[PDB]
């Protein structure tokens, strides 16, 4: 059930990754769930590049690039978090709607 049971867990993570995103209240939790979604897509990707495409790996390289960009985004978002917590002394996300 290798090729079949893992994909059955991709969605069962991806979905959760979205839900925690929407119902998130603090910035760090939203970023965590974002990273979780990216890892879900990564996992949905890799298995495809193990059943087939073994002559020239086309998924593992793409997985590497996805992880690199995930790290970059997780750096930039937290950097923005620093400045927002500097401006206002609380990072409650859903209590800032002064741009509407």
């Amino acid at each position: 059930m290798m090729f079949e049971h893992v994909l059955f867990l991709s969605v069962y993570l991806f979905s959760i990754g979205i839900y925690g995103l929407i119902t998130s209240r603090n910035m760090v939790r939203a970023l965590i769930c974002l990273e979780l979604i990216l890892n879900s897509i990564n996992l949905n990707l890799v298995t495809f590049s193990d059943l087939f495409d073994s002559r020239q790996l086309k998924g593992d390289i793409f997985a590497i690039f996805v992880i690199a960009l995930a790290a970059a985004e997780a750096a930039i978002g937290l950097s923005i978090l620093s400045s927002i917590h500097r401006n206002r002394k609380s990072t409650r996300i859903n209590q800032s709607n002064l741009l509407n």
């Binding site: 290798m2 867990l9 069962y12 760090v28 193990d50 087939f52 020239q56 750096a75 609380s90 409650r92």
Partner: protein
């Protein structure tokens, strides 16, 4: 290379059941540090999923660049969000909890019924020349080693300036 035998599905189900509880801990627990530690658990148990399938690099790297740098960075970040212990009791927040737990389940149902109609074990037979080469004599750190630089030249040349720009932006933003 290959796997032991019928011990495979045992570890498969074990890791799946661990990862489900991990994700539920990520999304349910209110204390953010517990959430981050459960996220680390999720990521190590998915690195083990990567390692089970005979893809070695994209497993150990994923374990080094995420279960390391990113998690300790997020731990440092949670030292800046004060005020925890919000409400509880069966969708603590507003009815938005129910609306999400509805639409997400619709999304699930859709994809989770789309998937078990494609004969993956039949989509593997139609490609019996892709994974039939192995270049003649190669191991799986040289496969990536070369096929990253022989045809994936442009994105590899590109990612570096993205990293540099992200560094510069992060330092200029985080610093007051």
């Amino acid at each position: 290379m290959d796997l032991p035998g019928p011990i495979h599905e045992i570890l498969m189900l074990f890791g799946e059941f661990i990862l489900l509880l991990g994700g539920l801990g990520v999304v349910l627990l209110t204390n953010p540090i517990y959430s981050a530690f459960s996220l680390g658990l999720v990521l190590v148990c998915i690195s083990l999923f990567y390692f089970l399938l005979n893809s070695y690099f994209v497993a150990v790297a994923q374990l080094l660049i995420y279960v390391g740098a990113i998690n300790v960075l997020i731990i440092f970040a949670v030292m800046f969000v004060n005020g925890s212990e919000w409400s509880k009791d069966k969708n603590y927040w507003t009815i938005g909890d129910g609306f999400t737990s509805l639409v997400c389940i619709t999304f699930v149902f859709s994809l989770m019924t789309t998937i078990p109609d494609t004969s993956w074990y039949g989509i593997l037979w139609t490609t019996r020349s892709n994974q039939i080469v192995e270049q003649g004599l190669i191991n799986n750190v040289q496969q990536i080693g070369i096929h990253l630089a022989t045809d994936f030249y442009l994105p590899f040349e590109l990612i570096s300036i993205i990293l540099l720009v992200s560094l510069i932006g992060a330092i200029t933003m985080a610093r007051q």
